[PDB]
Amino acid sequence: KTHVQLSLPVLQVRDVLVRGFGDSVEEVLSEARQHLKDGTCGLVEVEKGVLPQLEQPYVFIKRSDAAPHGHVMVELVAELEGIQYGRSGETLGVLVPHVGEIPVAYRKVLLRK
């Protein structure tokens, strides 16, 4: 399937134990996709002071369209030193590994895979 329905656990930035996916744009996008597939991916909602507490490169989920079955259609965009790899809509948040942190909410997305 070109798209997969996911429910992403929303984590508080100060709870997150593994603060990024890796060391290159290509690695973080690869790892993010693997974690999304394995259900081991969390979402941190971006506000003032969140991104400096996480590790670059960042992986964002961005709205790709204006929402089947409650699931917002999203795609992956990475960022390293102010340059983004991909072009998409509004940021829904930054992806991180989920290693058992308690979420505050869930974000229903349809992931272009």
Side-chain angles (χ1 to χ4, degrees), residues 1-112:
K1 278 177 189 309
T2 69
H3 285 78
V4 59
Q5 276 180 3
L6 299 174
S7 284
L8 297 183
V10 177
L11 308 180
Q12 305 190 294
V13 66
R14 292 185 185 278
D15 285 342
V16 170
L17 297 178
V18 186
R19 281 170 185 276
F21 282 114
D23 300 332
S24 75
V25 162
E26 291 162 278
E27 188 180 13
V28 300
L29 284 169
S30 184
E31 282 293 335
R33 284 194 173 93
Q34 192 65 55
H35 280 80
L36 285 163
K37 175 233 163 110
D38 296 342
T40 54
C41 190
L43 179 63
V44 182
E45 291 185 324
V46 175
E47 288 185 342
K48 288 304 204 292
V50 167
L51 283 178
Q53 295 188 70
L54 298 173
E55 300 174 336
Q56 293 195 49
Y58 310 128
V59 176
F60 301 110
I61 46 157
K62 284 179 167 299
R63 191 195 213 89
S64 64
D65 188 9
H69 315 269
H71 295 256
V72 175
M73 297 195 39
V74 300
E75 56 200 337
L76 299 192
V77 174
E79 177 186 307
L80 180 56
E81 295 151 353
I83 305 170
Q84 294 199 338
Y85 302 82
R87 154 178 224 275
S88 187
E90 193 197 350
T91 295
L92 277 76
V94 47
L95 300 184
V96 295
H98 187 221
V99 296
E101 300 94 334
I102 307 306
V104 293
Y106 288 90
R107 197 71 210 254
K108 290 183 296 171
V109 303
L110 197 45
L111 170 65
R112 190 175 298 169

